[PDB]
């Protein structure tokens, strides 16, 4: 298990995808043409996880860039690392989706889906040992929300024994005021609970709140929010990208992090947005969470912590023990040794020391309940259904999406209330 196949769908998916590839190319010492210009051997040791080796020692991302809207094709190709992508992996439609899930999932996106599946199969066939897939998308749009979830269900059929990882971006009224985003998110959640192995909840409300209150910016653009997401996505893939023992592949992470199949929604975190005890307190603090939820309103089923930089590992061990002792009630007693910690030598660009946090907390229900409240505000008066029932859907399917996300919250609550004796 080495090669992961990246997929980016929609505006959000492609732009966070673009930033992801910019950062990891810089860390691995790859320039916009795709040549190796670095110094350390650790940059190349697990390069094959995300990069294909073409002729003339070219390193090409294993990325599949997808959208129903053209124009997003131009922005990615004109961007800083536009040249490095494989031209045949661009699979772009005609009329767009216009923030409609039923267009992405059932009708207009369903027509473009087989031409994407060709690119996936071509990339997957060449993999020495394919481990799985990582999608990047929003759940508030139309393409990434609906076609991205169709792609998930379709890739599952042809690769049921590979890992399906996602970086699903949750919508927020503070960042985007499109009124039907709560409908799109809830429909996507209904698919994600059933068909993904692990979903990172990158929440725009938390990204807004961080940019305003911590980073001091009075009104943040999509560029400011992405600076945090690219730092997070770089962090959570550090175990996959460099030499290490812990969470080194997508199944080993999944096995350690996911104690129940449906409960695979992680609360990401990053620090700083410095000393080892400060890092350790910052990453466990609610203010550094990329999902807008308070850990102290529930319990951690499992946690993965990734430290990056030259630092005393003795100090890291003492500190991670310190917070588990001090915050003991916020970790379920019935899963022993559920907090794991890796340390990578190579720090990211800019910072000398950083810390990345993946937590499977029962407090993640606060994010689903928030979407559930914005959903039921519209659905109980049958508002805006003509966008969806026109494209072919039934009310029954809307009700099942609400019930499935209510069950998910009920199950997170069950295990939060669970006790050992």
């Amino acid at each position: 298990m080495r090669e992961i196949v990246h997929i980016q769908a929609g505006q959000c998916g492609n732009q966070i995808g673009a930033k992801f590839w910019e950062v990891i190319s810089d860390e691995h010492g790859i320039d916009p043409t795709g040549s190796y210009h670095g110094d350390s051997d650790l940059q190349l040791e697990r390069i094959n996880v995300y990069y294909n080796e073409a002729t003339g020692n070219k390193y090409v991302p294993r990325a599949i860039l997808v959208d129903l809207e053209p124009g997003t094709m131009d922005s990615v190709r004109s961007g800083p690392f536009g040249q490095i992508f494989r031209p045949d992996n661009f699979v772009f439609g005609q009329s767009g989706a216009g923030n409609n899930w039923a267009k992405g999932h059932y009708t207009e996106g369903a027509e473009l889906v087989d031409s994407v599946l060709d690119v996936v199969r071509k990339e997957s066939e060449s993999c020495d040992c394919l481990q799985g897939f990582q999608l990047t998308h929003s759940l508030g749009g139309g393409t990434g929300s609906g076609m991205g979830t169709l792609l998930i269900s379709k890739i599952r059929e042809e690769y049921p024994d590979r890992i399906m990882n996602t970086f699903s971006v949750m919508p927020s009224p503070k960042v985007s005021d499109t009124v039907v985003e709560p409908y799109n998110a809830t429909l996507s959640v209904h698919q994600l609970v059933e068909n993904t192995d692990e979903t990172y909840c990158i929440d725009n409300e938390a990204l807004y709140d961080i940019c305003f209150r911590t980073l001091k910016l009075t009104t943040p653009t999509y560029g400011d929010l992405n600076h945090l997401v690219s730092a997070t996505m770089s962090g959570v893939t550090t175990c996959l990208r460099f030499p290490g023992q812990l969470n080194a592949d997508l199944r080993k992470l999944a096995v350690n992090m996911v104690p129940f199949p449906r409960l695979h929604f992680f609360m990401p975190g990053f620090a700083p947005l410095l000393t080892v005890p400060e890092l350790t307190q910052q990453m466990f603090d609610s203010k550094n969470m990329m999902a807008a939820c308070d850990p102290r309103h529930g319990r951690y089923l499992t946690v993965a912590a990734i430290f990056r930089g030259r630092m005393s590992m003795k100090e890291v061990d003492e500190q991670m023990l310190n917070v588990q002792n001090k915050n003991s009630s916020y970790f379920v007693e019935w899963i022993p040794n559920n907090v794991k910690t890796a340390v990578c030598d190579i720090p990211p660009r800019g910072l000398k020391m950083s810390a990345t946090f993946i937590g499977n907390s029962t407090a993640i229900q606060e994010l689903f309940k928030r979407i559930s409240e914005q959903f039921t505000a519209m659905f109980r008066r049958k508002a805006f259904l003509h966008w969806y029932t026109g494209e072919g859907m039934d009310e029954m399917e809307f009700t099942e999406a609400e019930s499935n996300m209510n069950d998910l919250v009920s199950e997170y609550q069950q295990y939060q209330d669970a006790t050992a004796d």
Binding site: T107, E157, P160, E391, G392
Partner: protein, 57 residues
């Protein structure tokens, strides 16, 4: 008796092992069969969605 018991142990280890490895293949295949059958049920639902758009026009 030493031979009889040494053979019995080899016999029953071999039979215990073959029963588990066949039982495991049944269980794994049935788990994967149910996963695909649920995924194929979504294709039949998506076909009714696309028909109820054209049969409403």
């Amino acid at each position: 008796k030493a031979i009889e018991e040494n053979n019995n142990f080899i016999k029953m280890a071999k039979e215990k092992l073959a029963q588990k490895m066949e039982s495991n293949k049944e269980n794994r295949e049935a788990h994967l069969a149910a996963m695909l059958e649920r995924l194929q049920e979504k294709d039949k639902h998506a076909e009714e969605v696309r028909k109820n758009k054209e049969l409403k026009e």
